[PDB]
Design an enzyme around this catalytic site. Structure first.
Site: not given
Lengths: 301, 301
Positions: B41, B143, B145
């Site tokens: 993503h 942040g 991820c």
């Protein structure tokens, strides 16, 4: 979001851990620049521990009685000296993995990460606090002596603890990296015991703030108390007193959440006097006191 | 002695963490040999998340839309492909810090360490479990991820988790390192929700053993139960069922302590039906279920 007991990343410290052997005793040492730090009881015999004269025992030793191994490569001990209760082993090689570091002494209530080590090899990392009675509730097995505790600020490792021993109550005692014990404990076989512990009030408050930040609000209430009226109740529960300094330090959490410290204090006062009644805060059924205000800010922002 | 929530030393993984940018989105990536792994993503717009066709979005991208930075030095993306829900960014340089590693998928109930990262920089490490409903109760801010979860066996890092998102209940969801989600969760903006969670019974038992190993015995009792009679009571409390395999796995703890599993099960049955009555086990007022039998053995020996 979420809230977890979080340790600092341990890589910078793993590169400093070595194995130190003297006689039949092996334990861990910390290798920074051309110096290796380790507990001075590494030179002792079980017979010696009953009444060691360390300056006498160390004088009867030579550099070659000290085997230092950084993984495979043995490190040559070119000189040795004592600094209080740590031993400083001078070696010919500077550790190329030496991070920027400082030696800092922490205060009861402050937290740090522990890199538990065996035979110079890191086995795990966990967060704990210096208890008000200057012990730490660690997890240490035989052979973990010399494991260090540390904080990290930017790229700089503040070493604050070296592990020395376990007390009969199952808690742990050590020194700062200048060899000075935390608490009234000594590296001799005596009848040492930890004093009476208390709860770290400012940390419990920080953790109540962390809960609010994470959407747990059932314990909040409409009341406010005075510092004095709060202390008068908490000290009855073996809670450390709360100071105006503590209230100042909690400022940023008060701001982010819009709950005044004394407002939160009224909640904590109510939780002390009523229990939790089968409810939990941040997954805990007890009031948690090993997160500082800084730890909460760090993790919740 | 002592018992702590203990993570694995994180150094080997810190050397693999990088920053991956695409558009205005920055997150973390895992750099092993000449490949960088990260959530797919990373190529999406908020508008895209409502119904992304990832194979379509990725085809409209070129290598130069991907900025990878390992600290300062930018890494040149020489090729990119998708593997399920992770993106694989081929780069010209093999990571010299690449440890021996494997990609392993774990089971609900197993534990792992999480190295939480921001902008490619490690910020903390903590231990958690894969919940029976395939979420994890992590600590993750915007942040994070691309932060990974891992175990360490000998010198080999088994990567088992990459972080992708937070669910509305505050819990977290991600994939294994082959890009396959844990649980029924998808990297699209939908009305996803975690299913009903349960307690990891075999872990609670392991933790009761850890307590016995550490001198807490107040909850022990003279009774023994059958597997079936235990399950019949525990499932009433939203506890996972206990299997003979679980009983076998608990063998070494049963041996070290000399308490049969079904004997301990009778204690747990009693604790479920009576509560803890203001008592604590290993410093906890709740039954703890995020230590596996292996974690206990590891830490208690």
């Amino acid at each position: 979001s979420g809230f977890r007991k979080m340790a600092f990343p341990s890589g910078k410290v793993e590169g400093c851990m070595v194995q130190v052997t003297c006689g039949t005793t092996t334990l861990n040492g910390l290798w920074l620049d051309d110096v290796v730090y380790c507990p001075r009881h590494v030179i002792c015999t079980s017979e010696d521990m009953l009444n060691p004269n360390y300056e006498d025992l160390l004088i009867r030793k030579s550099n070659h009685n000290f085997l230092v191994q950084a993984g495979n490569v043995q490190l040559r001990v070119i000189g040795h000296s004592m600094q209080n209760c740590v031993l400083k082993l001078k070696v010919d090689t500077a550790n190329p993995k030496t991070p920027k570091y400082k030696f800092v002494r922490i205060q009861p209530g402050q937290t740090f990460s522990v890199l538990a080590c065996y035979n110079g090899s890191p086995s795990g990392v966990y967060q704990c606090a210096m208890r008000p009675n200057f012990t730490i509730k660690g997890s240490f097995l035989n052979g973990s002596c010399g494991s260090v505790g540390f904080n990290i600020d930017y790229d700089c490792v503040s070493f604050c603890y070296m592990h020395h021993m376990e007390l009969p109550t199952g808690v742990h005692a050590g020194t700062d990296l200048e060899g000075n014990f935390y608490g009234p404990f000594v590296d001799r076989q005596t009848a040492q015991a930890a004093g009476t512990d208390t709860t770290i009030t400012v940390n419990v408050l920080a953790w109540l703030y962390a809960a609010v930040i994470n959407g747990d609000r059932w314990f909040l209430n409409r009341f406010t108390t005075t510092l004095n009226d709060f202390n008068l109740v908490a000290m009855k529960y073996n809670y450390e007193p709360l100071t105006q300094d503590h209230v100042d330090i909690l400022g940023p959490l008060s701001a982010q959440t819009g709950i005044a410290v004394l407002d939160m204090c009224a909640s904590l006062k109510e939780l002390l006097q009523n229990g939790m009644n089968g409810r939990t805060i941040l997954g805990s059924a007890l009031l948690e006191d090993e997160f500082t205000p800084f730890d909460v800010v760090r993790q919740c922002s």
